Amino acid sequence: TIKTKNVDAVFVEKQKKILSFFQDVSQLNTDDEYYKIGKDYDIEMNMDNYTNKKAVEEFLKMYRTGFMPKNLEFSVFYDKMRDEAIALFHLFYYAKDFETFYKTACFARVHLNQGQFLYAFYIAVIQRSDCHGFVVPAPYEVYPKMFMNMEVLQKIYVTKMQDGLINPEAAAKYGIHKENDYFVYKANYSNAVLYNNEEQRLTYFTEDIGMNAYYYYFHSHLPFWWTSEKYGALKERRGEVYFYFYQQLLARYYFERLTNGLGKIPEFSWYSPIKTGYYPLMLTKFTPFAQRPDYYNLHTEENYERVRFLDTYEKTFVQFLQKDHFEAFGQKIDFHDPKAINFVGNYWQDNADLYGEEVTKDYQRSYEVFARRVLGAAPMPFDKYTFMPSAMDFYQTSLRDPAFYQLYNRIVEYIVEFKQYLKPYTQDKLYFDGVKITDVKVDKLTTFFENFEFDASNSVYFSKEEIKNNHVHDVKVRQPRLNHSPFNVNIEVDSNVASDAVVKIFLAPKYDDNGIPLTLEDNWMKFFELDWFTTKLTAGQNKIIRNSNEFVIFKEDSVPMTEIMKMLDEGKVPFDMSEEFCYMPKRLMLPRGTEGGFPFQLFVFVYPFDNKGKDLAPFESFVLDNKPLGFPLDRPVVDALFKVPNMYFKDIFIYHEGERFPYKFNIPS
């Protein structure tokens, strides 16, 4: 009941070497051969084993100067740390073949900082062509400390320090149980100990382990600091991809807001206090994460120069808008051209493609970075390697901070400003000659919470003894997560001539906060894409059934590594972990319903699938179409020029079943 895939001899060996690097991540097994290789591995001597002579040499210059020390906390948002990560990445990426790649990782495991290494290695496995189709573990199994509050962490430490339970019945009262040879820890979301404002209503979504894993994967698939030359025709669509990822996410987030009675993400000002604080319960081996109190003055002394930069970055965009056509960064740009999204997105991201370069440079200040830093409310870094981490210093923690959504909402709104320059689609562009959707029905939509466990053993240090006996996997975290029942969408379509067609499904809200029905005019960016697929219509009447379990845009829960070691002994590999790893998890498709049925709408659009003109398959198997991302809702709409027979809006209601509140799953006795 987990989507499998079969696998040969050479594959399993490599995959085992790859997975070796994600276990006991913060320690070293002296007896493991990865260590014997690693200790003595000579990079200079091996120079002929890399595609890029200057990458080896650049790495070597940095490595003698000195890399970040071990145990210190790694973040890519800081110059020196990132530069070392990139130098390391290149070395992984330009290794002639697997053997060389493997050995280089061995050395790097042994000699360099843990976070820096996993960061670079993870990315490398995703980017190397010979590695395509291999599997990596879930971010939460690799970095467990970042996916869980203190309370849990500390129970784990205590149990480990005691080598078990002094009182099993007392431990039980704290949600700690022995299940055969596992220690299982129940975990509440933070609102169960902290309700310091209404945003805490959303913790089952913002603290969700999958959602946060999802953002991490997105970063890794194409990090901002690197070109996208490797992905070919997506290079000319990179900005579009950046807008759409964020647009989709904020729609999804917004949906969660609506169902907990919260409305719009609030606007903010670099020159004013920001309302909602963030009080993180994460610990770092060396420090606590930094808090932002409520009404925090973003314009305090330490931030003056920072705010001057950020304000100018924005103002420079506002200038672009005002002048329509202009030259910036070596490019004549026209805001009338829909292709300009590429520039717009690239600018807001300060990625390598903005400059037409392979890697970004220190003097090219990113807006995202400094915005993250200021809103993170940290004191000034002590030095190049010693900073006070906030949620927004890591891709694995960002979604936890309401301020993150404020920051990307603002960015998305500026891109929407650019999108106002595009002419709206006319009838002719949308009309599907002789095709009409006559009905849509939907099975009941119910959400519900359900326990989920993940391997949390990397959070813990084992003894020399335990590392040798390989007893390194006995810590699991149990947590209630959002889920929903599978559902069919029944679509009835009429057409004169048989034809190849594209079907698209979107989710959007039905009402604003006041209970007025949504116009497309104001609300086209609040539509969330559920699925696209192709069918063949016949003359007459058509019945199209599509199940939620088969929506192209979502993945299944990933499998724990231990379960993957099991499968590799059988020649099996978890399919969704191989090629669908960076999709949103299925269980989070729907926002949490209400007991009464919260009102939403399904938008179904059917259009002709002409041929395979402009065709994305290098980055994402997403857009085998000539069409903008989120077509037909990638620009302003006029309600009356828009609605055509091959469109259907269906009113639907999202229900919720069982326990309403995650914490009711975590009570003892």
Ligand X SMILES: *[C@@H]1O[C@H](CO)[C@@H](O[C@@H]2O[C@H](CO)[C@@H](O[C@@H]3O[C@H](CO[C@@H]4O[C@H](CO)[C@@H](O)[C@H](O)[C@@H]4O)[C@@H](O)[C@H](O[C@H]4O[C@H](CO)[C@@H](O)[C@H](O)[C@@H]4O)[C@@H]3O)[C@H](O)[C@H]2NC(C)=O)[C@H](O)[C@H]1NC(C)=O
Ligand Y SMILES: *[C@@H]1O[C@H](CO)[C@@H](O[C@@H]2O[C@H](CO)[C@@H](O[C@@H]3O[C@H](CO[C@H]4O[C@H](CO[C@H]5O[C@H](CO)[C@@H](O)[C@H](O)[C@@H]5O)[C@@H](O)[C@H](O)[C@@H]4O)[C@@H](O)[C@H](O[C@H]4O[C@H](CO)[C@@H](O)[C@H](O)[C@@H]4O)[C@@H]3O)[C@H](O)[C@H]2NC(C)=O)[C@H](O)[C@H]1NC(C)=O
Ligand Z SMILES: *[C@@H]1O[C@H](CO)[C@@H](O[C@@H]2O[C@H](CO)[C@@H](O[C@@H]3O[C@H](CO[C@H]4O[C@H](CO[C@H]5O[C@H](CO)[C@@H](O)[C@H](O)[C@@H]5O)[C@@H](O)[C@H](O)[C@@H]4O)[C@@H](O)[C@H](O[C@H]4O[C@H](CO)[C@@H](O)[C@H](O)[C@@H]4O[C@H]4O[C@H](CO)[C@@H](O)[C@H](O)[C@@H]4O)[C@@H]3O)[C@H](O)[C@H]2NC(C)=O)[C@H](O)[C@H]1NC(C)=O
Which is closer to a second copy, CB of 191 or CB of 351?
191
Residue 173 is a binding residue for ligand X (CB under 6 A): yes
Residue selected from 232, 288, 658, 668 as contacting ligand X according to rule CB under 6 A: 668
Structure-token match 């705010």, residue found = 307
Task: Tell whether omega for the bond before 591 is within 30 degrees of 0, i.e. cis.
Answer: no
262's contact among ligand Y, ligand X, a second copy, none, with CB below 5 to 8 A by partner kind, is a second copy
In contact, 548 and 587? CB cutoff 8 Å: no
Strands 540-547 and 488-495: antiparallel
In contact, 588 and 623? CB cutoff 8 Å: no
Residue selected from 66, 379, 515, 596 as contacting ligand Y according to rule CB under 6 A: 66
532 by DSSP, 3-state: which?
A: strand
Question: Which helix (H) or strand (E) covers residue 311, if one does?
Answer: helix 304-323
CB of 322 to ligand Z, least distance (A): 48
Interacting residues with ligand Y between 586 and 605 (CB under 6 A)? none
668's contact among a second copy, ligand X, ligand Y, none, with CB below 5 to 8 A by partner kind, is ligand X
| Helix runs in 420-560, H state only | 427-430, 464-468, 520-523
Which is closer to ligand X, CB of 176 or CB of 407?
176
Nearest alpha-carbon partner for 628 in 473, 438, 465, 430:
430
Q: State the Cα–Cα distance between residues 371 and 350, nearest whole angstrom.
A: 12
CB of 397 to ligand Y, least distance (A): 25
CB of 67 to ligand Y, least distance (A): 7
Q: State the Cα–Cα distance between residues 400 and 520, nearest whole angstrom.
A: 30
Residue 61 is a binding residue for ligand Y (CB under 6 A): no
Site track 489-518 with a second copy (rule: CB under 8 A), x = hit: -----------------------xxxx---
CB of 94 to ligand Z, least distance (A): 23
Structure-token match 């970040």, residue found = 68
Q: State the Cα–Cα distance between residues 402 and 411, nearest whole angstrom.
A: 15
Nearest alpha-carbon partner for 389 in 525, 286, 248, 254:
286
Which is closer to ligand Y, CB of 65 or CB of 322?
65
Residue selected from 133, 164, 232, 263 as contacting a second copy according to rule CB under 8 A: 263
Footprint of ligand Z on this chain (CB under 6 A)? 66-67, 69
Residue 65 is a binding residue for ligand Y (CB under 6 A): no
If phi > 0 it is left, if psi is from -120 to 50 it is alpha, else beta; for residue 330 that is: left
Which is closer to ligand X, CB of 535 or CB of 666?
666
Radius of gyration of the chain from Cα atoms?
25
Q: Which two tokens stand for residue 204?
A: 């089952």
Judged by CB under 6 A, the stretch of 249-257, 410-418, 616-624, 661-669 that binds ligand X is 661-669
Which is closer to a second copy, CB of 97 or CB of 198?
198
Which is closer to ligand X, CB of 189 or CB of 408?
189
Which is closer to ligand Y, CB of 71 or CB of 312?
71
594's contact among ligand Y, ligand Z, a second copy, none, with CB below 5 to 8 A by partner kind, is a second copy
Q: Which two tokens stand for residue 544?
A: 């199209």
Q: State the Cα–Cα distance between residues 573 and 413, nearest whole angstrom.
A: 41
CB of 155 to ligand X, least distance (A): 8
To the nearest 10 degrees (0 to 180), the angle between helices 367-375 and 402-419 is 140
Question: Which helix (H) or strand (E) covers residue 442, if one does?
Answer: strand 435-442
CB of 481 to ligand X, least distance (A): 15
Residue selected from 186, 473, 476, 526 as contacting ligand X according to rule CB under 6 A: 186
CB of 520 to ligand X, least distance (A): 10
Strands 182-186 and 475-484: parallel
Which is closer to ligand X, CB of 155 or CB of 587?
155
In contact, 88 and 120? CB cutoff 8 Å: yes
Q: Is residue 404 packed enough to be buried (19+ CB in 10 Å), middle (13-18) or exposed (0-12)? A: buried
Backbone angles phi, psi at 349, to 5 degrees: -105, -15
Residue 69 is a binding residue for ligand Y (CB under 6 A): yes
Nearest alpha-carbon partner for 578 in 554, 549, 558:
558
Site track 455-494 with ligand X (rule: CB under 6 A), x = hit: ----------------------------------------
CB of 69 to ligand Y, least distance (A): 3
Which is closer to ligand Y, CB of 71 or CB of 538?
71
Which is closer to ligand Y, CB of 41 or CB of 431?
41
175's contact among ligand X, ligand Y, ligand Z, none, with CB below 5 to 8 A by partner kind, is ligand X
Q: State the Cα–Cα distance between residues 460 and 475, nearest whole angstrom.
A: 8
CB of 68 to ligand Z, least distance (A): 8
Which is closer to a second copy, CB of 248 or CB of 259?
259
CB of 594 to ligand X, least distance (A): 21
CB of 143 to ligand X, least distance (A): 21
- Give the other-Cβ count within 10 Å of 55's Cβ: 19
Residue 613 is a binding residue for ligand Y (CB under 6 A): no
Cβ-closest position to ligand Y:
69
186's contact among ligand X, a second copy, ligand Z, none, with CB below 5 to 8 A by partner kind, is ligand X
- Give the other-Cβ count within 10 Å of 297's Cβ: 13
Residue 195 is a binding residue for a second copy (CB under 8 A): yes
Strands 176-179 and 598-608: unpaired
Which is closer to ligand Z, CB of 69 or CB of 596?
69
Which is closer to ligand Y, CB of 297 or CB of 386?
386
509-539 burial: b if 16+ Cβ within 10 Å, else e: bbebeeeeebebeebbbbbbbbbbeebebee
Contacting residues for 156 by C-beta, under 8 A, at least 6 apart: 183, 185, 456, 459, 460, 475
For residue 653, how many C-alpha atoms fall within 13 Å in the half-sphere facing its CB? Answer: 7
Which is closer to ligand Z, CB of 66 or CB of 330?
66
597's contact among a second copy, ligand Z, ligand X, none, with CB below 5 to 8 A by partner kind, is a second copy
Residue 666 is a binding residue for ligand X (CB under 6 A): yes
Contacting residues for 546 by C-beta, under 8 A, at least 6 apart: 488, 489, 491, 503, 505, 531, 533
Residue 279 is a binding residue for a second copy (CB under 8 A): no
| Helix runs in 386-475, H state only | 402-419, 427-430, 464-468
Tell me the site size for a second copy, rule CB under 8 A: 21
66's contact among ligand Y, ligand X, a second copy, none, with CB below 5 to 8 A by partner kind, is ligand Y
Residue selected from 20, 27, 594, 666 as contacting a second copy according to rule CB under 8 A: 594
Cβ-closest position to ligand Z:
66
CB of 279 to ligand Y, least distance (A): 28
- Give the other-Cβ count within 10 Å of 291's Cβ: 15
User: Binding residues for ligand Y, per CB under 6 A?
Assistant: 66, 69
User: Binding residues for a second copy, per CB under 8 A?
Assistant: 191-192, 195, 198, 200-201, 260-263, 512-515, 594-597, 660-661, 663
User: Binding residues for ligand X, per CB under 6 A?
Assistant: 173, 175, 186, 188, 192, 516, 663, 666-668
